[PDB]
């Protein structure tokens, strides 16, 4: 394959998910309340349009629609205890155009992934009731 995967950041709970790399990420939808509940990813994969449903369905959706020539070049957030579970409390992304988030209201251990060269092409991690952990595929 030749994949580059960094992360996941967060807890060891939930069940592993892995969408693999995409030809093109179309949109990312972060479901969010006190904590990061979930992430939906809409993408094309070769060339068919699929959307994957990660984490849980609580919280409020916050959608990042990527325009033409717009790519994800950063991810940051925080993970910490929420009711006996270590999950992502905050999650944000930046693109080559704009910054998004963070979404979620629970402080914890910060992580940050500035990408000086390259971009995010896919996601993996762990999900249950909430988003326990999130990691990322990279490509040039």
Ligand X SMILES: OC[C@H]1O[C@H](O)[C@@H](O)[C@@H](O)[C@@H]1O
Q: How far is CA 133 from CA 3, 11, 23, 45, 47, in A?
A: 19, 6, 23, 23, 28
Separation CA 12–CA 128 (nearest Å): 11
Burial class for 120, CB neighbours closer than 10 Å (0-12, 13-18, 19+): buried
Select the binding partner of residue 116 from ligand X, a second copy, Zn ion, none (C-beta < 5 to 8 A, by kind): a second copy
Select the binding partner of residue 59 from a second copy, ligand X, Zn ion, none (C-beta < 5 to 8 A, by kind): ligand X
Q: Is 17 in the site for a second copy (CB under 8 A)?
A: no
Tell whether 62 is in a known binding site: no
User: Going residue by residue from 12 to 41, which x/- string records binding to Zn ion, judged by CB under 5 A?
Assistant: ----------------------------x-
Closest-CA residue to 61 (of 36, 31, 93, 27)? 31
Q: Which is nearer to ligand X, 88 or 113 (CB)?
A: 88
Interface with a second copy (CB under 8 A): 1-9, 109-118, 124, 135, 138-140
């Amino acid at each position: 394959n030749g994949a580059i995967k960094v992360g996941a950041w967060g807890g060891n709970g939930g069940s592993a998910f892995d969408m693999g790399p995409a030809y093109r990420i179309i949109s990312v939808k972060i479901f969010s309340g006190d904590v990061v509940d979930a992430v939906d990813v809409t993408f094309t994969y070769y060339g068919k349009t699929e959307t994957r449903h990660f984490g849980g369905s609580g919280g409020t959706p916050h959608e990042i629609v990527l325009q033409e020539g717009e790519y994800l070049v950063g991810m940051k957030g925080e993970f910490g205890n929420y009711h006996g579970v270590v999950v992502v409390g905050k999650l944000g992304f930046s693109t080559n155009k704009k910054s998004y988030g963070p979404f979620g209201n629970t402080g914890g251990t910060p992580f940050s992934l500035p990408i000086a060269a390259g971009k995010i092409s896919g996601f993996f991690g762990r999900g249950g009731d909430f988003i326990d952990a999130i990691g990322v595929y990279l490509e040039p």
